[PDB]
Symmetry: D2
Subunit: 390 residues, 4 copies
């Protein structure tokens, strides 16, 4: 196992192993690599059979699979080369306008652009401004919906909200889906019922942590305050939803919107969020931690509704061309999921008429032109498309 | 080579025991890709029941690759015999769903017994299974919409086709005045206008028929003149659509709209069985390559576009719900057929005449829900973690 | 002058004889226009029961003109007694229709008040029972806005046409829908608090009613206030689309809005308001000009098209009279140039309109040609009260 | 009787003097109801005395008395037509809008306004006697015939009573004023008969309404409507599909009848009598004949009010406050209930599909006079009332 892996790389200089590992896409920071990385820390510049396996033994299974090219993208280093090329073609689109409707959204420089990819195997790549935290805004919708369905199951959740695109309420007298603001609001009321906004938020927060594999998650109070004061439309919705009895019994609405606004102000970076999208691409299992955050039905349902409802008015166009479930938000983030392969976060503040990141949208189209990630792309015949999984 | 495979089935090998092993891969002896081998076997049985290396290699030599993959269980569904057994269970479960009304609006659709129910599977590897009434021919009707839309996009390309017709569900014309998509009648009619322009219907129809043959691997494709006459006569709302389309200039220049409507009804009147249709379905599942004949019928462009639209628009008003729960591109028609594609896996046709309020076959819809509950074919199901679903792929 | 009148009713005229002929013109002795004359009779009765050219003239002098037109049969309904006879018959017929559901007031409560443009009054049923204007206030308050701010201003904020939340211009559809009524409410007496606002609208409402009963139900207000989720939704959507005038406090505007819906009237009191619109802005009993013709016309047009909720198209077609209904069960009904009236029954039909009222309005038009498009010269079988 | 009249008009009465007086009440010597009295005048034909006057005038003295005793709706007509002129001139200066090309022959310069009161008083200015197709203006007329023969309950079994805002909740067209409804109405009239007979009937009906003034048919327009009528065929098949026609209806035929109806020709003059008939409660003002039941006239006016102007109907009914019908030929059939009716014709149409000049004229008409539905008769403020 370890021995086998040992030769694969009479004495192994650590830095040689480190690079070999970093080329598989895995990060030394990987939670699943801790024991091995610690063991390396302990020993620390060259390793031998007995010793190597001493460090590696604990993680050997994951290390073997990285080195013996069994990850979803066998050649990651090449794949990231294309990601960079794509990232840069999109960088060249300066159009669109940053949402100014609140000061926190206005602050952001138009030229912040980043793409963070995390596969279902935990292979990571980043380019651009990945580490800059920004608000999930509408990107939180699929996430909290996932939490909702995960906790309460599909049937309960959809007693309250619809399964399809509108085209305020539908014929059943419920919001059309969780991706619209009315739907999202209703969903917000389903999560952790009978508890105060503080604990509710803590719960959701801890849940987003699991999804991120404990990568950066935060809260913008500045954004929250601005969301609250300027939230007149959301209030109009709340009051309508209340009058239509769309909420669970014993719901304090004004609280649900307070809660709702908070979720929208939850902060992420491209990195942290790409892992969240990976958890969705991995069937509920966080790729880096390996823990099961969400139930498959919750993930399935979410991926469905990001497909149909995800892009706002660009959803149909998006689904037809990109053919991938994705979530957009006013922050300029696009949470993009390629099922069974990877997930990613694209962030640029400038948005188009539809309200989606211009660069992100551009990048998504490009990404799918290049590789066959399109839902209806065929695995055996994809014509001239590049397949990163081979 | 073949040689290795001989040991993969004693010194001398009964012919019938080679057959049953082959037939168990889900493959059929009728397979066009098996012909050279199947013929050597039939010929050899003349020169007489049993074989030896050299004699075996004599028969299997041409088709070994396919035969090797089959006996090396390298096909999509490695255990086909087990998978089909589940299909039969789901079939029986749906057979118990007698609700729904057969479409009476014309004599040809009313002629059908409410109890005609069949399912046919064809994988991308040519593995076949059928149960219920597979052999009974019925009109595609709306099941033809994706197929003819595939043809247009194949010939004319995405960009052109969608100048005339839209890419998304309606939710008569969209904002740009094009029909909403190829899946609605307004769209299907427009698309019908795009195929084989500048020729008379007879040749247009023949072209479309050629195409359909290739897609069915030359299995049964036919025409019901009875239905065509009745579609023609009763087609008032299609004509309304035709005139609105002409008035709105949705058709290409020089289009003859009354003729395009004749062509349209003709296409709706094209006949298939569950078997022949399931192969057409598997082609879309196979990225444009007919799973049984190995020929490339459709461009990946066309196939992808079609699957997307069948996903969003294919189930009528049950589309949103269908895509959510079943999560497979599918197409329903008044005939009671459901053209179902599981990408990268297989394709199938479920046929029952009784329709639900949405217009979809009751037993079909029921079967499709069940199908996805059992196995993870749902678009967004995970290949690694599908919980307690079963995965025929392994 | 009055001389003539004298001989129109022997050497001496018993007073009762004068009152009874007067009350037959449909006029009421309480008519503010009759005050002087009636004051004089009560005084003469103190200085005692008969009148004479000099005594008479002394009483009827001040009021002659009205009293003259009254007895020259020159009012709009020349024969009132015979008209009110039919109203009573129409009342009893509609009374027999008990279908409908009360808002959640007895279901049995039903009543009709007629006030013509000449001040002629008739009342039957429970007409003194006070009830909330509710949506019946919408036209009245729109009339105030148009009156004060002019047509062009008011309609910068709200639309003139039936809906078919906001229209293409992002204004509410009209003053008759809630969104439109809430916006309109925002137009009246800007820059002042709700107390002074409410008074202003109330004094206006008093003039329209000829100072007849106008009141406010706080019980209703508190209810409409807590249960108002629908309107608060509308208030925020309105605020979000900037449909209000700059510097509007919407939460305050909504409170004002609930206040206007809670204003109480009676069938009688209200019928005068209706007759005011029928009179081109002049309260028929006082003679004061309450509203501008511009305002009165705009209101009637919108009551015609938008007034009955979803029954507007059907009501305007068949009845052809501008009218407004409210959840309280009242129907504000105006016959232009003729009269105005208030039908009130609590039980409502599926449309939100009073079962009895709606029935009455249909009956009314079938009998008399008041229909917008009925003809004055050839009405066929319809009776014409103006002759 | 007539003796009374005679003194009103010295010992003897030069005929021309009676003419000009007669013509000044707005009446026309061409007036059908004056026929007997006009006959007698040429019979005698340059002065008249009692006997002789009473001889010629006796015939119709009730009309001549009313006219000369200013008992007509507009007592001072000669003043009123002066304002109509001013209004006409004011409107004639609107050069905006486009002629319907889809008629192009018609010069955009053509503008005319014909007035006919409920008393038979006539006035014309601009291009009155140029014939033009009713087109959509025929819809209310068509509907009135239907409701006249078939009654309210039957006609509205097939078509709706209210504005749209293709079919309504009941699956019937929204009203007679939309092509869908108009087509349906057309299938209602004179059923069980061939289009040749159907057309003759509607033609005779329209004649009545016009008091036998010009009514005609443009085959040119008709052929063109048929060839370009794809929209109407689409509607036709949809109606057929939804079973909106009476059973046994030949849908393709109806469309043809429909096309023919839109191609019927009127002049501002003949058409104003039609509108006047609708203003007079179904009685043709000039003939005196009863053409339409009050039921039909009332229903027609209601629907013209709400549905008449296309998308401008709401804006129109609000401001103008008069029932009217507009058409692609640039015609506007305008009805003032109980007062008069008129046709305003200019080819160029605004974005709404309404005659630019006509619309402009109507607005001016109601600003000047209180003909507005909800204008008050006692207090109109600063408006002008032709009825006094």
């Amino acid at each position: 196992l370890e021995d086998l892996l040992f030769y694969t790389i009479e004495k192994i200089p650590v830095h040689k192993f480190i690079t070999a590992l970093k080329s598989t896409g895995l990060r030394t920071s990987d939670p699943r690599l801790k024991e091995c990385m610690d063991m390396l820390r302990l020993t620390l510049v060259m390793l031998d059979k007995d010793l190597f396996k001493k460090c590696v033994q604990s993680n050997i299974v994951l290390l073997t699979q990285a080195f013996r090219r069994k990850f979803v993208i066998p050649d990651f280093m090449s794949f990231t080369s294309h990601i960079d090329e794509l990232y840069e073609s999109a960088k060249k689109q300066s159009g669109g306008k940053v949402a100014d409707y609140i000061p926190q959204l206005a602050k952001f420089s138009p030229d912040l652009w980043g793409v963070s990819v995390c596969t279902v195997d935990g292979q990571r790549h980043s380019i651009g401004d990945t580490k800059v935290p920004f608000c999930l805004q509408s990107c939180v919708k699929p996430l909290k919906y996932a939490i909702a369905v995960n906790d309460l199951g599909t049937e309960y959740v959809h007693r309250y909200v619809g399964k399809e695109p509108s085209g305020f309420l539908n014929e059943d007298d419920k919001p059309h889906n969780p991706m619209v603001n009315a739907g999202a609001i209703v969903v917000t009321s389903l999560i952790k019922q009978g508890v105060n906004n503080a604990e509710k938020f803590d719960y959701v927060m801890q849940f987003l942590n699991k999804m991120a594999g404990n990568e950066y998650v935060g809260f913008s109070n500045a954004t929250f305050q601005s969301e609250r004061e300027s939230g007149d439309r959301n209030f109009a919705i709340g009051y309508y939803l209340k009058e239509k009895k769309c909420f669970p019994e014993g719901t304090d609405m004004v609280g649900i919107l307070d809660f709702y606004f908070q979720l929208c102000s939850i902060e992420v970076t491209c990195e942290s969020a790409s892992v969240m999208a990976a958890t969705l691409a991995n069937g509920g299992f966080c790729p880096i931690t390996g823990e099961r955050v969400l139930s498959p039905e919750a993930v399935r349902n979410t991926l469905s509704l990001m497909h149909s409802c995800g892009m706002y008015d660009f959803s149909g166009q998006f689904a037809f061309h990109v053919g991938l479930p994705a979530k957009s938000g006013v922050a300029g983030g696009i949470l993009l999921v390629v099922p069974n392969v990877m997930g990613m976060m694209c962030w640029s503040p400038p948005l188009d008429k539809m309200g989606n990141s211009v660069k992100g949208i551009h990048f998504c189209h490009d990404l799918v032109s290049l590789c066959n990630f399109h839902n209806y792309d065929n695995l055996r015949h994809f014509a001239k498309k590049l397949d990163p999984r081979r």
